[PDB]
Design a binder for this molecule. Structure first.
Ligand SMILES: COc1cccc(F)c1-c1cc2c(cn1)cnn2-c1ccc(N2CCN(C)CC2)cc1
Length: 283
């Protein structure tokens, strides 16, 4: 459900937070309530198809969970669509680690736990993020963790619907038609890679060409990556990675199963750990 009016009525546009071909992100304040919001602006011309964006909204609107970016509403005005969300002041983990350098095992553990909670919720709702990385895990000024940037999740969903227009079809073809050849457990892998990102400032093979990496991943003898420095981390951390980075999705554990893992179920994991990191931000 979409408000057909100028959002500059309801909000004040403070600051641009960056742009892409895909969208523009604005910091803004609610003129009445006074609370800060994130406003995602998308330039939608009459001719182009709106389904991709409609799917993103529907995902956001239909997700009420702590670890997923809250949605307030959306505004269609002057052929510009504004999606309104809760503000996450510290930004993404990538925005942050660029300044602070590498996170600590416990900070990583807390982040992983929080993402897993979000994923478990998403998967229960039969939704897949499919773009879990540092740059999509947002932090608020309170050190709470929020999953964001469902534009890809929306893009594959909008295609899956577009793909309606079956019996002589082969099972693998059916799987691509319905699910795209993969399942929810892809997110678990991405988390594993993200855990490495946070530890090392780069995912594995970041210096290698992308097309080449795709090739390497499809070879028979592809070994899952590990953490570079054995000694710097605990057995539980190494294992968390070993397990999340299970090559076979038949044998890779679910978000729920992962939440009971030693690393992410240990006590003392809370936002304080992240607050410590955000203090390193003003340093
Ligand atoms: C990965 O997030 C996206 C990716 C694509 C399109 C989006 F709309 C988003 C997106 C960003 C969002 C929210 C929802 N979605 C909510 N809060 N924020 C957000 C993100 C960063 C900052 N800065 C970063 C820079 N730092 C110095 C100040 C804080 C401030 C607020």
């Amino acid at each position: 459900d979409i408000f057909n009016r100028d959002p500059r009525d309801h909000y004040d546009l403070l600051q641009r937070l960056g742009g892409g071909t895909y969208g523009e992100v604005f910091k803004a304040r609610d003129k009445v309530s006074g609370d800060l919001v994130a406003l995602k602006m998308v330039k939608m011309e009459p001719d182009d198809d709106v389904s991709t964006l409609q799917k993103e909204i529907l995902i956001l609107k239909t997700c009420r969970h702590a670890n997923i970016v809250a949605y307030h509403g959306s505004y269609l005005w002057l052929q510009k669509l504004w999606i309104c969300m809760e503000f996450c002041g510290a930004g993404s983990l990538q925005d942050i680690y660029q300044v602070t350098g590498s996170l600590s095992e416990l900070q990583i553990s807390y982040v992983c736990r929080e993402v897993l909670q979000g994923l478990a919720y998403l998967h229960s709702q039969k939704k897949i993020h499919r773009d879990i990385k540092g740059a999509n895990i947002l932090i608020n000024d309170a050190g709470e963790v929020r999953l964001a940037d469902f534009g890809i999740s929306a893009q594959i969903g909008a295609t899956l619907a577009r793909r309606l227009a079956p019996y002589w079809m082969a099972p693998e073809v059916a799987a691509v038609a319905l699910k795209g050849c993969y399942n929810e457990l892809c997110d678990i892998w991405s988390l594993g890679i993200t855990a490495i990102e946070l530890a090392e400032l780069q995912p594995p093979l970041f210096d290698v060409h992308p097309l080449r990496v795709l090739f390497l991943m499809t070879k028979s003898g592809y070994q899952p990556p590990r953490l570079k420095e054995k000694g710097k981390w605990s057995a539980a951390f190494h294992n968390f990675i070993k397990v999340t980075l299970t090559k076979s999705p038949k044998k890779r554990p679910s978000a729920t199963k992962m939440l009971s893992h030693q690393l992410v179920s240990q006590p003392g994991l809370n936002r304080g750990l992240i607050l410590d990191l955000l203090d390193k931000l003003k340093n």
